[PDB]
Design a protein around this ligand. Structure first.
Ligand SMILES: *[C@@H]1[C@H](O)[C@@H](O)[C@H](OCCNC(=O)C(F)(F)F)[C@@H](C(=O)O)[C@H]1O
Ligand SMILES: *[C@@H]1O[C@H](CO)[C@@H](O)[C@H](O)[C@H]1NC(C)=O
Ligand SMILES: *[C@@H]1O[C@H](CO)[C@@H](O)[C@H](O)[C@H]1NC(C)=O
Ligand SMILES: *[C@@H]1O[C@H](CO)[C@@H](O)[C@H](O)[C@H]1NC(C)=O
Lengths: 384, 74
């Protein structure tokens, strides 16, 4: 990996993309610019900070990506304590800038294996006070070796739980109460798994990641990537949306910020995976108190879900996703309730149409699928 | 049979995620693409991006730690 420069022009393109799309830009600063005694040399960043403040750019900051593999990536080792010190230096430069309330996030470590756990714990002892969120990264598989079976395997989904618990163990012991973010996450590292990371099959891992992240106290999940060379892109090379874009848009329209819990009665509770939030109230069709249930069926037959008292006879909208043939779970096209999802034109996302179910009917979820169910007039006080 | 009973906990929220819970990255490597300017210019891509609002956009990657800011460069 060689150095590369970038222009004010690039900073401007990036920023207006973010700005004009209604997204909050987070910019990662080079943490491998060091002084003689392996402190962070901050003068380049000091320049970029100046340029950005001049232009009126509202921007949040990170410093470094996967510091845990700097030795492999650059034959430089930086330990957590130093990196924490490097983050206090950056916080200072930000306090003495024009957005002095600019947010700082870090340290964007890989999944918590023993070496990475040690790095993150010493980073938080030292620099914990100045970060607004702890960022770490998760990947289920190696993009080079991942198989279609791995993408469908609940033993693979389940590993994420352990990773989350290890991160929360480090954080509760150094900075109790600090927000925890996934700062870079995907099905598979090495740019994703060809013919898998870009397909309907990718949606099992993505929806499960979101469900478990919310349930276990992760506040923000950052998807590698919105767009890029990587098979894990939400949007392909021709700016066409892949099944995960649509999953993401559906989730965004239906799922609220208030996290609840759902679970299956029984000992087999591995292949049928269920999540429960308050319905997104900004959804014009729904009202305060409504529930959003979402469910993943990795069984090879339809399952029929029965809502408990007092929700057993409520009106339910289904939003079931299913691949458009002929390539089944390897398809790059998806249908919502039997209707193919396609942009109306370059400027126009289609409607996302519910299928009202007969009140009192069980929730049919076919083999290898995922669906949202909105429980209308649930009147859940914790939501209102 | 394939009928499955759900238990629901609804007494209080167990957690509050950000309105921006489902957020996205652009890899730092994409600033080394000759076509970078055309790609983020795309009206079509802007439409798709706006659909995920609100969201954080993280500009970051392996290349984060190999990118030097040049106030001169065109
Ligand atoms: C995290 C790391 O920060 C990423 O830079 C890295 O992505 C590699 C290349 N990705 C692309 O250029 C893109 F965006 F996909 F087109 C990933 C990874 O291994 O996939 C991860 O280590
Ligand atoms: C940091 O880098 C800049 C030029 O790259 C230089 O002005 C400054 O003296 C450096 N400090 C070091 C290497 O300690
Ligand atoms: C970590 O690295 C710093 C800076 O290189 C060094 O001075 C120190 O001995 C190390 N700290 C610990 C706790 O090992
Ligand atoms: C379906 O899954 C079962 C496990 O419930 C498995 O043993 C069986 O061979 C699979 N295929 C079909 C179509 O039943």
């Amino acid at each position: 990996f060689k150095n590369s420069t970038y222009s004010r022009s690039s900073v401007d393109v990036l920023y207006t993309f973010a700005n004009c799309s209604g997204l909050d830009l987070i910019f990662g600063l080079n943490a491998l610019l060091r002084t003689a005694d392996l402190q962070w040399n901050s003068s380049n960043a000091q320049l970029l900070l100046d340029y950005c403040s001049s232009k009126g750019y509202n921007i949040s900051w990170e410093l470094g990506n996967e510091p845990n593999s700097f030795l492999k990536k650059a034959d430089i080792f930086i330990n957590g304590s130093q990196l924490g010190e490097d983050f206090i230096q950056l916080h200072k430069l930000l306090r003495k800038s024009t957005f002095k309330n600019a947010k700082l996030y870090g340290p964007d470590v890989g999944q918590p294996r023993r070496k990475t756990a040690k790095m993150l714990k010493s980073f938080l002892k030292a620099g914990g006070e100045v970060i607004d969120s702890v960022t770490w990264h998760h990947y289920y598989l190696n993009g080079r070796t991942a198989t279609r079976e791995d993408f469908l395997n609940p033993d693979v989904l389940d590993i994420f739980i352990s990773s989350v618990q290890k991160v929360f163990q480090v954080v509760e012991s150094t900075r109790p109460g600090k927000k925890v973010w996934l700062g870079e996450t995907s099905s598979a590292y090495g740019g994703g798994a060809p013919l898998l990371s870009d397909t309907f099959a990718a949606g099992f891992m993505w929806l499960d990641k979101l469900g478990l992240s919310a349930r276990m106290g992760i506040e923000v999940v950052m998807r590698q990537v919105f767009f890029g060379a990587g098979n894990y892109h939400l949007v392909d090379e021709n700016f066409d949306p892949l099944p995960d874009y649509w999953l993401s848009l559906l989730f965004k329209k239906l799922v609220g910020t208030k996290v609840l819990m759902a679970s299956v009665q029984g000992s087999k509770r591995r292949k049928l995976r269920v999540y429960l939030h308050c319905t997104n109230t900004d959804n014009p069709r729904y009202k305060e108190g409504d529930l959003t249930l979402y469910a993943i069926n990795l069984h090879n037959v339809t399952k029929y879900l029965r809502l408990p008292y007092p929700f057993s006879n409520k009106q339910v909208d289904k939003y079931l996703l299913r691949p458009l043939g002929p390539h089944g779970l390897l398809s790059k096209s998806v249908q919502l309730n039997g209707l193919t999802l396609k942009m109306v034109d370059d400027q126009t996302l289609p409607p996302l149409m519910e299928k009202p179910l007969r009140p009192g009917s069980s929730l049919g979820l076919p083999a290898f699928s995922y669906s949202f169910f909105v429980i209308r007039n649930a009147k859940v006080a914790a939501c209102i | 049979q394939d009928v499955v009973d759900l238990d629901f906990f609804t007494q209080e929220p167990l957690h509050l995620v950000s309105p921006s819970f489902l957020s996205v990255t652009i890899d730092a490597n994409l600033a080394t693409d000759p076509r970078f300017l055309i790609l983020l210019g795309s009206p079509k891509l802007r439409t798709l991006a706006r659909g995920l609002s609100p969201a954080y956009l993280r500009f970051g990657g392996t290349k984060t730690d190999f990118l030097i800011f040049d106030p001169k460069k065109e």
